[PDB]
Every structure is written in structure tokens, then in C-alpha cells.
Amino acid sequence: VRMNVLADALKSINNAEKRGKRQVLIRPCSKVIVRFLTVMMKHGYIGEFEIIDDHRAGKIVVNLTGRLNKCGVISPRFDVQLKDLEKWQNNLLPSRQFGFIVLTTSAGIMDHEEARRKHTGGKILGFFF
Template sequence: MHACVCSSSLSSARVFGAPLYLFFAAPPESSLRMVRVSVLNDALKTIYNAEKRGKRQVKIRPSSKVIIKFLLVMQKHGYISEFEYVDDHRAGKIVVELNGRMNKCGVISPRFDVGVKDIEPWTARLLPSRQFGYIVLTTSAGIMDHEEARRKNVGGKVLGFFY
């Protein structure tokens, strides 16, 4: 049996026959804001949703260095056309030109450690086929796709994937 009492002042309730006093301090309505857990996840979801809807352009905000590096990897492989950073004296915006080639993109959370020898099982798990799609890693040599990491013989943490 659960008892839940919600009030903005002192409340008295009985749980299993004993009095229960609860204090609830309601925050003012203007201070209720969503907290962004993963800026990269929000950006990739925005791109994916715009791609599904057939949009040619999408605006991402806020911006971060990780998002820009991830987009550079996507652009290098032709999954997006181009993108432009717009400085609005806050967190910044990125305008991405889509070309309709992307099927799926996403973030892997938590960022698992991946050695060079462990890259192959990750590609088998995340990507639809061997020669299709890329896993993006953050390494000591920078943010790169899994093929470049294998060529440079470096491991790192898995950021996300796209195909």
C-alpha cells in the first residue's frame, strides 16, 4: 500500500495508522526548465528526425566542439552536405544541409572504452553490414571513424554511429 500526499504547504496524512507530516516546497513556475543530459544526443536526434521528414536543412542548438567534430566525420563520408556555425553570443547554432543519404544515427551512452582489437565486434553489433556505416570514436588522436582508428592503431571511447 502506497500513500502519496502532494501539497505546497504542511500536510498531515496517515500511513499505516501513524501520522505523517510532509513538507513540499514548490519551485516558482519560471524556474522549471529541462536539463540537457546529452547535447550530442539531442543534435543527432534532431538530424535524424529532419532526415526522416525529408527536410533539406536543420538547425541544431546548442553547439559544441564534439558536435562539430562529429559532423565533420559525417561530412567527410558524404552523409551530410555542409554545415555552418552561427555565433549568437550564447551557445551557438549549427545549420546543417542534409542530402537524404542518412538512414540512422545515434549516440552510444555510456561511452564505452574500445581497444583496437574490440572495434570489429562493435561494428558487427551497431552497423547493418561490414562495408556500410561508421562508428565514431573519440581517441587520443582526436575524433575519428572506426576505420581511421584501425589504420592509426588507436582505441578510444565510442561516441556514436551513423549509416
């Protein structure tokens, strides 16, 4: 059945970004997906998105800009300590110049640079470049 809806959302937006489309419909909508899309938007990788509100689990329509090469999710959500984050960003990111391991800490869902800044460790969610 359907598990880990963030994987479905990232796979859908990656498939549509590879196809050259301008908008993606992803369903269902959860709060972690919204935070991931917000993190990508603050770095200017996707753009504006709308949360279509059903009384069920909602839907999202995101707008695409061709700035995204690969958006990916890491399953299972491994425990990333702060000392071990360098190995993770050596494995997943394509270069030291760009790319983002999204990870959730008790301070919120953020990037690896913000996790370095705030001295907190968390669980890994994704990467995008």
C-alpha cells in the same frame, strides 16, 4: 534536464532526415558536435553546415542530403579497446560495406577504419548509415 548535447543534435538531424527536410537547426553547439558533423561530411553523408555564432552556446544549421538512413549516438561513452572494436562494429553497423562508429582517441575524433589504421583505441560516440 539537458544532458549529452550530441544526443540531442543527432536525434534532431535524424528526425528531420526521416521527415524529408532539407535543413536542420540544432542548438546548442559544441566542438564535439562540430567534429562529428565534419566526420559525416568528409564521407558525404550530410553536406555543408553553418555555425551561427551567438555569444552564448552557438547554433548550427546543417544541410541535408537523403544519403543518411540512421545517425545514432552511444551513451555512455564506453571504453573501446582495439581488440573489442570488431564486436562493436558487428553490433551497431548494418553491414561490413558501410556504416561508421565514430570514436574519440588521443589522435582525435575519427571513424573506426581510421582507428584501425592508426592503431589507437578510444571512447565510442556514434554510428551513421
